[PDB]
Ligand binder design. Structure first.
Ligand SMILES: CC(C)(COP(=O)(O)OP(=O)(O)OC[C@H]1O[C@@H](n2cnc3c(N)ncnc32)[C@H](O)[C@@H]1OP(=O)(O)O)[C@@H](O)C(=O)NCCC(=O)NCCS
Ligand SMILES: CC(=O)NCCCCNC(=N)N
Length: 216
């Protein structure tokens, strides 16, 4: 289970029992700059946030790029069906009040608005939950290579659609280059909590979460 790319970079599937290295990479080079995480407080993700990402590892849909045994890029993906809008709404309620609750309330608003299984009459979708590249390796299409790996895994699994919430404009530009289509835009200034406070305040240039899909 190894796909050589680039120079000394190999793409591998994250194995159940190797999640610590993946989380260490995510905490170093994904979470500090990911707009929802950077736009909420404290800077570090809560346990439930990290645990949800790692809950996708058993699906075989999580991949890393390795260089000298070190993870330099990672993608986390998992399945969803037409019940996901209801499921995410309930999960947002469960964790309301914390950093993860704020992030989930935005992600759940987006899932309700996109509702891709009903929108495209497909039974399921492979959703990309996280994508990050070491800053020293950015601009070498490692993100695109990992997204292509996910698409092929989706094809093998019978999914007819891949979806991804590009909270970052760099990810939006990447998936545009891959031929994904935009299906939803939610501006961060437009998303409040029940008390009227803006939930996510991310650094510019990230002004919106843009959801893209790819038909398989
Ligand atoms: C999103 C991400 C994986 C894209 O990285 P990537 O695949 O290497 O990006 P690309 O190969 O498409 O690079 C295209 C150009 O955009 C720039 N670019 C990519 N990400 C950038 C970033 N955070 N900041 C500034 N410029 C960036 C590249 O450096 C490159 O330009 P250059 O070669 O002239 O310098 C990366 O930005 C990242 O890890 N961000 C932090 C976590 C995050 O926000 N993930 C996505 C949430 S949707
Ligand atoms: C592909 C991608 O990275 N999308 C952004 C997801 C939002 C952040 N998720 C968590 N903080 N758990």
């Amino acid at each position: 289970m190894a796909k050589p790319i680039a120079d000394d970079i190999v793409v591998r599937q994250v194995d159940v029992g190797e999640t610590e290295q993946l989380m260490t990479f995510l905490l170093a080079h994904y979470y500090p700059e990911e707009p929802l995480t950077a736009g909420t407080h404290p800077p570090e993700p809560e346990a439930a946030d990290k645990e949800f990402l790692l809950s996708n590892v058993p699906f075989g849909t999580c991949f890393v790029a390795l260089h000298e045994g070190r993870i330099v890029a990672a993608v986390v993906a998992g399945p969803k069906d037409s019940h996901e809008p209801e499921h995410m709404a309930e999960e947002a309620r469960k964790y309301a009040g914390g950093k993860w609750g704020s992030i989930l309330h935005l992600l759940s608003a987006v899932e309700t608005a996109t509702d891709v299984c009903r929108r495209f009459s497909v039974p399921s979708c492979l959703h990309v939950h996280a994508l990050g590249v070491d800053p020293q390796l950015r601009g070498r299409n490692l993100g695109g290579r990992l997204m292509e790996t996910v698409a092929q895994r989706g094809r093998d699994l019978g999914h007819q659609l891949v979806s991804v919430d590009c909270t970052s404009v760099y990810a939006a530009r990447l998936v545009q280059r891959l031929g994904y289509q935009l299906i939803n835009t939610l501006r961060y200034v437009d998303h409040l909590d029940a008390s009227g406070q803006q939930v996510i305040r991310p650094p510019p240039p990230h002004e919106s979460v843009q959801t893209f899909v790819l038909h398989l």
